[PDB]
């Protein structure tokens, strides 16, 4: 299980499920038919968001990693 | 760790200020210390003396003599006294019947 893993893996995780469901409600609000899992993950923004969660869970948590994680969530949620 | 976080009790922070306030140069130096051993109040005193000694290189000779006359460059020799075999404490005696 996940409690046994000694190293966090983003794939098939709560973070990937939460951000994936969040991005599907955003498409329905915009009335768009772009509802493909592979396409969403491919985007660069997701790559930066999954690099920040894997650094907070594994590496030491500092104020520099909470600000890098914040910028990656402001691009996915269009929070300019 | 920031000193206010490391030292919650105000008294400890007052000891840190003392050297700089005396030489009227607060907010002019950056200090990076590492204290080990002792307790809350023993660590501040040890830092005060270290900062004071290292702050004598950035002050005039006359100011260093004032620090000495203020008791900021002297090592307090007061340490715990041992207990004696026939007494309750270092100097306290068992009740005289």
């Amino acid at each position: 299980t996940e409690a046994d893993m000694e190293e966090y893996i983003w794939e098939n995780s709560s973070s990937e499920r939460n951000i994936l469901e969040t991005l599907l409600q955003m498409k329905a609000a915009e009335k768009n038919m772009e509802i493909n899992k592979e396409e969403l993950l491919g985007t660069k923004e997701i790559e930066e968001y999954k690099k920040s969660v894997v650094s907070l869970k594994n590496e030491e948590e500092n104020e520099n990693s909470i600000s890098q994680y914040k910028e990656s969530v402001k691009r996915l949620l269009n929070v300019t | 760790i920031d000193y206010q976080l490391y030292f919650p009790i105000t008294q400890d922070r007052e000891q840190l200020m003392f050297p700089f306030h005396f030489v009227d140069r607060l907010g002019k130096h950056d200090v990076t210390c590492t204290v080990s051993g002792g307790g809350r109040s023993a660590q501040a005193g040890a830092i005060r003396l270290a900062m004071a000694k290292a702050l004598c290189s950035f002050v005039t000779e006359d100011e260093v003599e004032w620090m000495r006359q203020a008791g900021l460059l002297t090592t307090d020799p007061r340490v715990r006294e041992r207990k004696k075999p026939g007494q309750e404490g270092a100097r306290r005696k068992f009740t005289w019947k």
């Binding site: 939460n18 969040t22 914040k70 949620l77 929070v79 | 976080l5």
Partner: protein
Amino acid sequence: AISRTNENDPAKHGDQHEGQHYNISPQDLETVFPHGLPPRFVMQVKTFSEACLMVRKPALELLHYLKNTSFAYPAIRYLLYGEKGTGKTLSLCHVIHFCAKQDWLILHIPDAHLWVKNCRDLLQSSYNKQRFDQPLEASTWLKNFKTTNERFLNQIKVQEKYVWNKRESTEKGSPLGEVVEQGITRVRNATDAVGIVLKELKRQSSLGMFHLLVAVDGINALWGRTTLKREDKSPIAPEELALVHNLRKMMKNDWHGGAIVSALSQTGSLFKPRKAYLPQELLGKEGFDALDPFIPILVSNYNPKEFESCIQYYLENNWLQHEKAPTEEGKKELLFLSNANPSLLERHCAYL
């Protein structure tokens, strides 16, 4: 008065007001903040006879997001984190006063650490026998929630039939107020009334009737540990509590038409060290996973500009009586002892 700003309307504050105190009126203080304000800030309001709050960047940054917030997308979680005594609680109040003026629905949990400790009457629930109720703690909140949102309690109406008992039930199409009044009068169905309030507000918000603000201070309690114990002296988990189980549903971003603003707090926390202030440490793995994705907002200590205006608000109210306080050398000691920390500075100035 260089420390006060004449603009007492929080929808027009900007970067040019940073460092200046604005005035929260008595009418808004009682209505908007019955239970929110810190306990030691109400002594200042009671002694100064005025609630003046500083405009800082944490709240200005967070007010700029709630103005450009799309009410069609799912609610966005905003988290305020910082070192102890840095103003995150007060910054949150700044946003509750911005949204209350704009006819938002304020769901304000002033301190969530109180629901997981020191509970004397911990009744077993009747709607679900695996959960515990907290009648004294849910009925204190309903009275304040009613005060803030008294107007909407009649416009908002329930869409289901909630059975309190065989004799007494609330029928579809009543005002929500009846639910609240039921929980304040009986002080035993209150815990169930709170659950109904959260469910109705969350569902109706999506429809578009009203904008909802979920203001939860001390949000790391929900996914931590408790000091409550069963009759057999066994530790109780936080999700067994019916009041704490229904409040986790509002934090999830499965609804639109509102924003979620929360604030961490180690003061009042359980089994957390004093110097722990980061989100993961306080929230934990369970808390971080639930909140994620969330926007963390840092609250820091007073900067040089903000520090001088705090001391000019205390000097303008004659609250620094010692004759060396106003001098340049007295402020250097306040700055050093406190390291520009609002609470340490405010605690050191209370006895000068």
